């Protein structure tokens, strides 16, 4: 008989180079020598937050007592963006939990124990340097503008909801970073745009997608759900009506197969119903600490897209 013990894996690959086609962090895993630097049995502490907004998802990691060779490989490439993947689970499988580029790295080795630090960004390089220069005339179909701008961003299309037969009412011009322009189109058309684990997600506010996840005491829930406001401020109201404005909170054992834009079903004894996801935070302490995930849910009032 065994116990139920945690497991994880961390991989470091070649520098990421942006080209003239969508970037996939998967293909950069292999190093010039072939197999990548894998780190399994070392105490690790990490925190990974995810959201549906302009900003990329960022995660922090700490590793104790790394071998000198690995640290040397990171002393080099300090000018470059190494690709990194993280996996976690329970002794039988490990689900992808983050993938991005090493934004920052530093080492402090006071006496007894060295402590390496990381800051990782989910597509930070693309979202902050992809320039654009486009224009359109009166009568252009809005569905064409959306596709044109996304292709400029150079990322795979996770999911998109086209506008239909919508047409521009006035001439438009777009410059600067493509991400910023798209985030502005979100406000005026009730659409949510956010990149996550390399995938572009374009959806409509208020509406939600089946029960892709069910939460219950069998599903490793942790404590009862509690109602928490989804924003730190309140807006004036007429009392688009379809927009968000309500939510709840839940916690569960670590499970990387969840994304901010997904949908979940809450099977508890007090609260029951369907909710959207709005925010994720993954925490982990291998030898000591939690191994759980926190979800911020938001009520929905739109159509079932």
């Amino acid at each position: 008989m065994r116990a139920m013990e945690r497991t994880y894996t961390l991989v470091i690959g070649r520098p990421v180079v942006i080209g003239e086609k969508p970037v996939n962090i998967e293909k950069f895993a292999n190093t010039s020598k072939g197999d990548a630097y894998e780190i399994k049995d070392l105490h690790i502490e990490f925190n990974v937050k995810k959201d549906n907004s302009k900003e990329p998802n960022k995660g922090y990691v700490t590793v104790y007592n790394l071998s000198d060779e690995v640290v040397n490989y990171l002393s080099v490439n300090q000018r470059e963006s190494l690709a990194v993947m993280l996996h976690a689970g329970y002794n039988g499988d490990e689900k992808l939990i983050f993938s991005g580029t090493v934004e920052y790295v530093e080492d402090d080795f006071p006496e007894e124990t060295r402590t390496t630090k990381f800051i990782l960004g989910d597509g930070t390089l693309n979202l902050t340097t992809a320039t654009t220069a486009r224009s359109y005339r009166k009568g252009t179909p809005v569905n064409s503008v959306l596709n044109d701008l996304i292709a400029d961003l150079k990322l795979p299309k996770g999911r998109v909801i086209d506008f239909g037969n919508q047409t521009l009412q006035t001439s438009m011009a777009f410059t600067g970073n493509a991400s910023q322009n798209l985030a502005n189109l979100a406000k005026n058309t009730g659409s949510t745009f956010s990149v996550q684990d390399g995938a572009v997600y374009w959806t409509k506010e208020g509406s939600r997608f089946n029960v892709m996840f069910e939460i219950s005491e069998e599903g490793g829930m942790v404590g009862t759900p509690t109602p928490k406001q989804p924003s730190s401020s309140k807006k004036l109201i007429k009392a688009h009506d379809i927009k968000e404005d309500v939510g709840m909170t839940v916690s569960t054992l670590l499970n990387g197969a969840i994304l901010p834009e997904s949908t979940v079903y809450l099977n508890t004894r007090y609260h029951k119903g369907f909710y959207k996801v709005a925010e994720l935070t993954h925490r982990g302490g291998y030898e000591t600490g939690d191994w759980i995930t926190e979800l911020g849910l938001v009520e929905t009032r739109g159509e079932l897209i």
Binding site: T129, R134, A173
Partner: peptide, 11 residues
């Protein structure tokens, strides 16, 4: 310096 350019589009 990163070999990137900014062009205004036609208005």
């Amino acid at each position: 310096p990163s070999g990137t350019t900014d062009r205004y589009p036609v208005i």
